[PDB]
Assembly symmetry: none
Homo-oligomer: 28 residues x 12
């Protein structure tokens, strides 16, 4: 009577990069 | 009576790149 | 009485690239 | 010689709700 | 010599709802 | 010498609802 | 010679809700 | 009494490229 | 010769809610 | 020759709520 | 009467990169 | 009557990189 269950989940809502807000520059 | 279940999920709603908001530049 | 179920899902609503908002430039 | 510039951006790549990965249940 | 510029952007690539991956249930 | 420019953009590539991947159920 | 610039950005890549990974239950 | 079920899903509502909002430039 | 610049940014990559990893329960 | 600059930023990458890792329960 | 269950979850809502708020520069 | 359960979770809401707030520079 063998029985095995496997439940796996990965990479949900993650950020290992860059979320930047505002960038501005130049003579004014 | 062998029995196996496997449930897997991956890459759901994730961002490892860049979400930028505003970019502006130049003489004014 | 062998039995196997496999459920898999991938790449749902994810962004590893760039969602940019506004880009502006040039002399004014 | 009046001059005004306004730059605004909002709601870019954001999640205040729920990104869920896997949901499973029931007798097995 | 009046001058006005206005730049606005909104709701770009955003999710305040639910991105779900897999849903499963029932007797097996 | 009056001058006005207005640039507006809205609702581009956004999801405040539900992107679901797989749904399964029932006796098996 | 009046001059005003205003740059604003808001809600970029944020989550004040719930990102859940795996949910499982039921008799097994 | 062999029995196998396989359920697979992929690439649903995802963006690994760029959703941009507004782009503007040039002398004004 | 009046001159004013204002730069503002808000709510970038923040979580005042709950990021949960795994949830499991039920008789086994 | 009046001149004023204002730079403001708020709520960047913060969590005043709960990031939980694993939750498990039930008879086994 | 063998029985095994395995539940795994990974990379949920994490940031090992850079969430920046405002960036500004240039002569003014 | 062998029985084994394994529950694992990893990388949930963590930041080993840099969350910066405001960056500004240049002659003014």
């Amino acid at each position: 009577h063998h029985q095995k269950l496997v439940f796996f989940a990965e990479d949900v809502g993650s950020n290992k990069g860059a979320i930047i807000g505002l960038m501005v520059g130049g003579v004014v």
